[PDB]
Hints:
Strand content of chain A: over 45%
Order of helices and strands of chain B: EEEEEEEEEEEEEEEEEEE
Largest interface: A-B, 52 and 46 residues
CATH topology of the largest domain in chain B: Immunoglobulin-like
Distance between the termini of chain B: 60 Å
Structural class of chain A: mainly beta
CATH superfamily of the largest domain in chain A: Immunoglobulins
CATH architecture of the largest domain in chain A: Sandwich
CATH class of the largest domain in chain B: Mainly Beta
Oligomer: heterodimer
Number of strands of chain A: 19
Helix content of chain A: under 10%
Number of strands of chain B: 19
Number of helices of chain A: 2
Helix content of chain B: under 10%
Number of domains of chain B: 2
Strand content of chain B: over 45%
CATH topology of the largest domain in chain A: Immunoglobulin-like
Shape of chain B: elongated
Order of helices and strands of chain A: EEEEEEEEEEEEHEEEEEHEE
Number of domains of chain A: 2
Number of helices of chain B: 0
Radius of gyration of chain A: 22 Å
Structural class of chain B: mainly beta
Distance between the termini of chain A: 54 Å
Largest sheet of chain A: 7 strands, mixed
Amino acid sequence: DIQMTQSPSSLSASLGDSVTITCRASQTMSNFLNWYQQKPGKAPKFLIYAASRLQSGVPSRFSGSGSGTQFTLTISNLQPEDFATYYCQQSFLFPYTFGGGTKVEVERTVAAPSVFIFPPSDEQLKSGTASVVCLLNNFYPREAKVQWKVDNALQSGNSQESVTEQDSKDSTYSLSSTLTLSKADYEKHKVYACEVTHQGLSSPVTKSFNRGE
Amino acid sequence: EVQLVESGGGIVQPGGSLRVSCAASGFSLSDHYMDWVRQAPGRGLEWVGRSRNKENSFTTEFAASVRRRFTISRDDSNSLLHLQMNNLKSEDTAVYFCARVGYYDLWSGYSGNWYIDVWGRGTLVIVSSASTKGPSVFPLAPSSKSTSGGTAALGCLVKDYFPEPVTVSWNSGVLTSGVHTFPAVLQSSGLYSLSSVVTVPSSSLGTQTYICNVNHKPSNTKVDKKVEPK
């Protein structure tokens, strides 16, 4: 019934900054809102109950506020251990629901991705499948649009992508997108391209090849 | 030390059943509400169900998506909480966390004044029909369309394996700088596929040897794939 919407879904800041996370409920729910923290690979950690009450042991730099349909979690003097995902959860009425989560990531300067394309190898072609791979290398922020085009036809649904965790060194992301067709489907077309749109590019960058070469 | 630890997860075929369990310590299990939450890989938390304490006769409730399929059992004499999941679907694949529920301002009764103060490790449940299979390793060969002004990209595509994981190294571990091994994706066929890439000086192509070492231990498959320019 009640659905929680968190904003923004991704947040970037540095040490010492004060970040604010918003949680909005589709219907009014007093102050029965809890906040949890989760880091990759670990279980969630209980942080805040009743919108503003801190659990014992939680550092006082965490604060919560809000009532009715809107709530906020604020983190002042952000520390290295604070970079994680945060979830709101309403305890007002069954069935109880969580927010979508919001990622507090390390902010850095914008960096345009390096785009590369890989046609399918002859070895996979002998098996009966063809995988075209498109690589975006060391970009920031994570927001990026990758479009597969086969003979100028936009592909939608027959590809899958994967994004690495934020790099511990230079704090960038990398993306891999695989478009897998069957061999007779692959032999029926000629042009294969991936078009990349990102904040760091002056214009969309298209990398393409013909099935011949 | 208050502790919750789960167990009993496994690979289950669609339509089967599976009982996950939660062992508690450091507190009287019968005096708290106990919830089950789940998290699909790479997604968010989803509240699954709840079992009430002894004051409320251990009554249970469940989310609509598992309501006609999941059941809770409490063995407070042994401090155990069992979640029985029947007629499992592909979408049931997730990490299942057992969670202790604590009430604040309990003078007001058992209303919405509760939180979840202790989470367990979580146990992974995967509902799949795929059987153990070693992967095929294809080369993502560097070429003109894989060069960016002195930088070239090359790699390996480790396709159609089950289950996770595979490990990938480059030149037996000699090569680390510029290596990005991506998390695997699950294909429509139920098999996994991942990519491992490395960016090198384009002037090193043809004169420096690059080998990707792939190991899929569940099928004891081990391959050393040389990647040459195209």
